[PDB]
Amino acid sequence: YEANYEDVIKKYKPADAKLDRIAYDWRLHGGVTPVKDQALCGSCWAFSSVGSVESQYAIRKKALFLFSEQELVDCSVKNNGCYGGYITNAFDDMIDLGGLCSQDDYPYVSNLPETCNLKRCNERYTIKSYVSIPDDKFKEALRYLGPISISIAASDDFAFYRGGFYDGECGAAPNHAVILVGYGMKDIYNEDTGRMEKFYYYIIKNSWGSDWGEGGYINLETDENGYKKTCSIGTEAYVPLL
């Protein structure tokens, strides 16, 4: 079910398109659905992967599609429900299970044990494949493909982040799954330099509710090319395709 980026970007980027590397934000272009809250459950892998599919349907279909993380939690045998999972495993099971359910047909119950029951789903929403995004290609992928389901190495500082300029530690190993929804640049005073410097960042959608960070989001530092990774973002990185 995996395609190669090399082939996919040829299809999605227009022939004569020039990438703007300074700023692009899918929140301004109808590509981002409301932030969700995983409550007390390690289902980040489901929120990341399903949210990336929500975004792809918004972009490609220009309408609001809200899907069920609970269905993956209950039915994705390749993953471990609230005990954790993988981005690739999740997309594989989206395909093999016959698609996602709407959020209203299959509502979220977090750590409450629930049997898998797809007979509760009326309509089903499939993806065709998914594509791994190379670490030197995040801005291009984000601009032409859409938001990216990414791993992140989250710390306690990240857990307790309530907005403002992030100065926290990163985790050792990737331990969380979030979504990249854009990039930007602002002028920020640089204390090791003693003046205003360009500060490039990726915009990350988390799944800990809109009371975490900045409306559920965080800006993490990158560079103009967008190769620099803060907290190991996108070590695993995939966009779902219709």
* Sites of contact with ligand C1P (CB under 6 A): 38, 42, 44-45, 80, 83-87, 151, 154, 156, 159, 174-177, 236
235, interface contact from ligand C1P, a second copy, none, CB < 5-8 Å by kind: none
Distances (CA, A) of 70 to 73, 105, 116, 173, 200: 5, 10, 9, 26, 35
**206 belongs to the catalytic site:** yes
| Nearest approach, Cβ of residue 46 and a second copy (Å) | 14
- Cβ 173 to a second copy shortest distance, Å: 16
Compare residues 99 and 168 and give the one whose CB is closer to a second copy. Answer: 168
| Residue 143 or 176 having the CB closest to ligand C1P | 176
Angle between helix 87-96 and 44-61 (nearest 10)? 60
Contacts with a second copy, 25-64, as mask; x by CB under 8 A: x-xxxxxxxxxxx-xxxx---------------x---xxx
Residue 8 or 82 having the CB closest to a second copy: 82
Among this protein's residues, is 175 annotated catalytic? no
User: For residues 123 and 25, what is the distance between their CA atoms, to the nearest angstrom?
Assistant: 30
The two tokens of residue 110 are 């977090």
Contact 88, 129 (CB under 8 A): no
Q: Which does residue 170 bind out of a second copy, ligand C1P, none, counting CB within 5 to 8 angstroms by kind?
A: none
Nearest residue to 110 (alpha-carbon basis) of 83, 78, 148, 145: 83
Q: CB under 5 to 8 A by kind: which of ligand C1P, a second copy, none does 147 bind?
A: none
User: Of these residues, 41, 82, 176, 219, which one is catalytic?
Assistant: 176
Residues that bind a second copy (CB under 8 A): 23, 25, 27-37, 39-42, 58, 62-64, 66, 82-83, 102-105, 107, 109, 111-113, 156, 159-164, 184, 186, 203, 208-212, 214-216
